[PDB]
Design a protein around this ligand. Sequence first.
Ligand SMILES: O=P(O)(O)OC[C@H]1O[C@H](O)[C@@H](O)[C@@H](O)[C@@H]1O
Ligand SMILES: [Mg+2]
Length: 448
Amino acid sequence: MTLPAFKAYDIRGRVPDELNEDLARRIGVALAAQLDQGPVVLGHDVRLASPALQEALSAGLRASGRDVIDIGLCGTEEVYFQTDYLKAAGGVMVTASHNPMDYNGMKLVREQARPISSDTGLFAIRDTVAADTAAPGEPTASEQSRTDKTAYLEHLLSYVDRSTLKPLKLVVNAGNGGAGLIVDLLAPHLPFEFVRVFHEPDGNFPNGIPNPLLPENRDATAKAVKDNGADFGIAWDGDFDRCFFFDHTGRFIEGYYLVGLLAQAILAKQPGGKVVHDPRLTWNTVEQVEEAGGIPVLCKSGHAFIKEKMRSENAVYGGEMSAHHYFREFAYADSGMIPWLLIAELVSQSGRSLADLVEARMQKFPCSGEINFKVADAKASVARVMEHYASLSPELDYTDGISADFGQWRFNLRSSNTEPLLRLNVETRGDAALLETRTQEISNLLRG
Ligand SMILES: O=P(O)(O)OC[C@H]1O[C@H](O)[C@@H](O)[C@@H](O)[C@@H]1O
Ligand SMILES: [Mg+2]
């Protein structure tokens, strides 16, 4: 067999049987042979095993002659930013994002923070590690500590005109991950009042693993918004590359609608630019990008595909509905921080609440939310759906699973790249009844 921790886009496994310091050191050795020349940036999240796994990575890297830039406890986007900003050969973030307590993992990038994925070097690294029985060498290169966040913070602040910001009251919920540290470093340069929930970094996760999609964790942000009269709330996953928004009523806003909203925010600053979007939910983004004078670019979901397409298109912004937002000047990388700064600026400048910024769009293109299915036979289940709707001759697109456009409604149905599940998304042209009846009909077919 093969090491189960090596996934399509990152390394993730239970410590210590699927991921451990020995494996981490071997990954450092193998990564060194995969990169162009230059040093390697290393950062890590709040999980208890993360520092030890990083040190092991560092040892393997340095045994292979790679200088190491240790940026310390950070978010994933800081590994992306520093890798590009410092013109490093590559970078590794030790993190398990939102996964349970007994899990860890790694996100690996090369020059300009370009992703290393299963077909772009990650499985080559796996196979090297799998067969490596060599005695560990000793370090022949140095590790430097580089925790200065100044350039990163300045880059974040450059997306907004600070003189236009209003003293909004913002709930922030780091979920005991790492986001609160960046919020607190940004706070002296911003007029906002922060209502801090689950703010302190704690890899024991006393308040639950950092996953804002869990309704119990969602409700902590919503309650703090409602109880404090906040303008809106923001939650993050543990490594804060994903951000989740709550309007002033406590309502969680589906990530889909943030894509069109952030695209309009960006296009005000970069007129005529291209905007990359995923195929799961599309109609609202296409319309809002076009209305704002931008050009929408359909792309397969997954950060590797999104970033590749943004690069080839010189795209100014890209967004998925899975709460990842990507910015050209941010090394084409995703940030959980840039989005809420932009939304705070848009609320401040427009005098509109976040709720009203999205309300008409939610009414115009209502969506099911992403619904996941673990079925006995995904392929037969998808076939059963397609056969049922064949007589309506939908317009079919195979960018990412199957997208079917029926005119007044459409769906996307695809296998996940991170779990063994089918993911369904449905949307309609302003028709909530058609949305529910078609969603339920597809669900029944899938469960057949
Ligand atoms: O729906 P999927 O394939 O499980 O991916 C969901 C998300 O996983 C990761 O967070 C990233 O790779 C995202 O780019 C992706 O959208
Ligand atoms: Mg994450």
